[PDB]
Amino acid sequence: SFSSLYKTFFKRNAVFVGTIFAGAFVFQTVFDTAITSWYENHNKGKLWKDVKARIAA
Amino acid sequence: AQTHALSNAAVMDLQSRWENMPSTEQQDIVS
Amino acid sequence: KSTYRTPNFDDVLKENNDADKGRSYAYFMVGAMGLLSSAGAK
Amino acid sequence: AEVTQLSNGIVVATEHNPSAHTASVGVVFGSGAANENPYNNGVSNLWKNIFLSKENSAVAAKEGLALSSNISRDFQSYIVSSLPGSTDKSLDFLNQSFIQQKANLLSSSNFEATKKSVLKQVQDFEENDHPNRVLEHLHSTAFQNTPLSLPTRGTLESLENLVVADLESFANNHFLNSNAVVVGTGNIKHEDLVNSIESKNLSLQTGTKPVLKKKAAFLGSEVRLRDDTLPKAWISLAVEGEPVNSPNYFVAKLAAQIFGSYNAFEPASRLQGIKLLDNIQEYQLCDNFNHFSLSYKDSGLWGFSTATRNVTMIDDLIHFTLKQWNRLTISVTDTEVERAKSLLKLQLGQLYESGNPVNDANLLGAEVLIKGSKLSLGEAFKKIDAITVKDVKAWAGKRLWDQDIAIAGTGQIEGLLDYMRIRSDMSMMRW
Numbered sequence A: 001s002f003s004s005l006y007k008t009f010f011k012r013n014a015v016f017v018g019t020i021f022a023g024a025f026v027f028q029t030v031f032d033t034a035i036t037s038w039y040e041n042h043n044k045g046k047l048w049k050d051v052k053a054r055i056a057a
Numbered sequence B: 001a002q003t004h005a006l007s008n009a010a011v012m013d014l015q016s017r018w019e020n021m022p023s024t025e026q027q028d029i030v031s
Numbered sequence C: 001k002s003t004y005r006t007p008n009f010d011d012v013l014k015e016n017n018d019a020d021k022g023r024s025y026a027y028f029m030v031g032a033m034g035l036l037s038s039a040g041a042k
Numbered sequence D: 001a002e003v004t005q006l007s008n009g010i011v012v013a014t015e016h017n018p019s020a021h022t023a024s025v026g027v028v029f030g031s032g033a034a035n036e037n038p039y040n041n042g043v044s045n046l047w048k049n050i051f052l053s054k055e056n057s058a059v060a061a062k063e064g065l066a067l068s069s070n071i072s073r074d075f076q077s078y079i080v081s082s083l084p085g086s087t088d089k090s091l092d093f094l095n096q097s098f099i100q101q102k103a104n105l106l107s108s109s110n111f112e113a114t115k116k117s118v119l120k121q122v123q124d125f126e127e128n129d130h131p132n133r134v135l136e137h138l139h140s141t142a143f144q145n146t147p148l149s150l151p152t153r154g155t156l157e158s159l160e161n162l163v164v165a166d167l168e169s170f171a172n173n174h175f176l177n178s179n180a181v182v183v184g185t186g187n188i189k190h191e192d193l194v195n196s197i198e199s200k201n202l203s204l205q206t207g208t209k210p211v212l213k214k215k216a217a218f219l220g221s222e223v224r225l226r227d228d229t230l231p232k233a234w235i236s237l238a239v240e241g242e243p244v245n246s247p248n249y250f251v252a253k254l255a256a257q258i259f260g261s262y263n264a265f266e267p268a269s270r271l272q273g274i275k276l277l278d279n280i281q282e283y284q285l286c287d288n289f290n291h292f293s294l295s296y297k298d299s300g301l302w303g304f305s306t307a308t309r310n311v312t313m314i315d316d317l318i319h320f321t322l323k324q325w326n327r328l329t330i331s332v333t334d335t336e337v338e339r340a341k342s343l344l345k346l347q348l349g350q351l352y353e354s355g356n357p358v359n360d361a362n363l364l365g366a367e368v369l370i371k372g373s374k375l376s377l378g379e380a381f382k383k384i385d386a387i388t389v390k391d392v393k394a395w396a397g398k399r400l401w402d403q404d405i406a407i408a409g410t411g412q413i414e415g416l417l418d419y420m421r422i423r424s425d426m427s428m429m430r431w
């Protein structure tokens, strides 16, 4: 299934470092966002986001 | 046909493997 | 047995491909490992 | 010079050359060291010695002719040289040798003498000849569990487990009419073209060669024969090559010729060549180079060999050679390609122009047993000139960049990094 389209992508070395670092940055950003979202939605009421509405009349 | 001291490489080659040897002299050796 | 009679290694040998199958897998994993190490270091 | 072809049950080939005056006619069989199981290894060598042993007196007594033989991987050849006017005698002797009858040639005393002579010869080869030993070990480690790795002379233990049944079985199973040609190199015009094909003057036992379950393989296995008694260290490297009848044969040959050979103890070899020679001359690392591009009917082997008195410098030599191979696939100047093309033209000219009828017969049979007719030297030169930098770069990228390699060595190999350091040096470098 590993066609020439995917085979060609495994030969660049001078430029691959920059794009791999950018991909690592994007992955860490999305991972941080996902973990923050899961920590948010695993606990409701205790957190300070909804106490504003709880005290609201 | 009327062999004598028939103990050749095939005799001890048979025990190790059988499918790898290409089925074209299996009939010869069994005969 | 002489040196030419190589001992059997079938216990760990895999499908008779010996091509980019293993190479691409290993390279992709180490690329991911570099990704994670770089992210942690940053 | 020209090539002729024809066939009726068998194949007959002839390359007339009136300049030479040493006519040689003999048969060639396309079944050698690659058509024998590991438990029956030296049967072909025993055949060669048993045809070179006893009737060599009869050939020189009854007539005049020198008979030779050669087994390389599958080309069991039995050439019978002679004078230009005495070819029919050679053909008649060959017929009385093979087709009828081989019973007299197969006796107890003659076979025992041949057996002990072959044992002594193989022991002497295994004792002294180191580079050939490492080459055979490279072959035996690159093709593990495949009918292409076992040596062409027979492992020591394999000789004494076969007497008359195995030899006759090999004769009845491989000496057939399907994989046999009758070369005619020398200065014979048309007698070979007519006398070879007759009503009954051809090899008996019509049939077919047994098929092989496994074709070939190549895995990156390492083999070491470390022993500190020897003074030097012989190591060889290899990669997967190409078989005969492929549109990469001459590109691979040119890639091998690019780096060429080298010999530090010759004043004419230290001042030519390409960069690694300059990088090596500064410190005395190596002595010999052999960039070989071997090809067989199943698979090939494009490699490298050396031998160093220095033992601490093995790692540097291997690293420099691998770095140069890496540089080959990215940046080669057109001058390098032109020089390699001229050198390869000269090399093939020497190989195919030698006045020996036996060598020409061997090459003719080798190239006719796979294709059907020999590829003439003019066409070879034309297609060599067809090669350019793009083709060699493409082939190098396809078959060298990050590919599985096989290693062998013997002698003082204490300073050789085992497998990962050598393999890593093909892609870890900045590209």
Ligand SMILES: CCCCCCCCCCCCCCCCCC(=O)O[C@@H](COC(=O)CCCCCCCCCCCCCCC)COP(=O)(O)OC[C@H](O)CO
Pocket: D315, D316, D318, D319, D417, D421, D422, D424, D425, D428, D429, D430
């Ligand atoms: C717990 C112990 C370690 C703690 C941390 C250690 C901190 C210090 C780290 C010191 C360097 C180690 C980091 C990884 C080094 C990778 C290996 C390396 O660079 O060395 C190779 C050196 O490789 C080369 O010479 C070629 C590659 C380099 C050329 C490309 C350079 C690209 C840019 C480099 C930027 C960094 C420059 C400084 C490098 C030190 C040796 O292998 P080889 O390719 O030579 O193979 C061996 C062969 O048989 C003999 O040569």
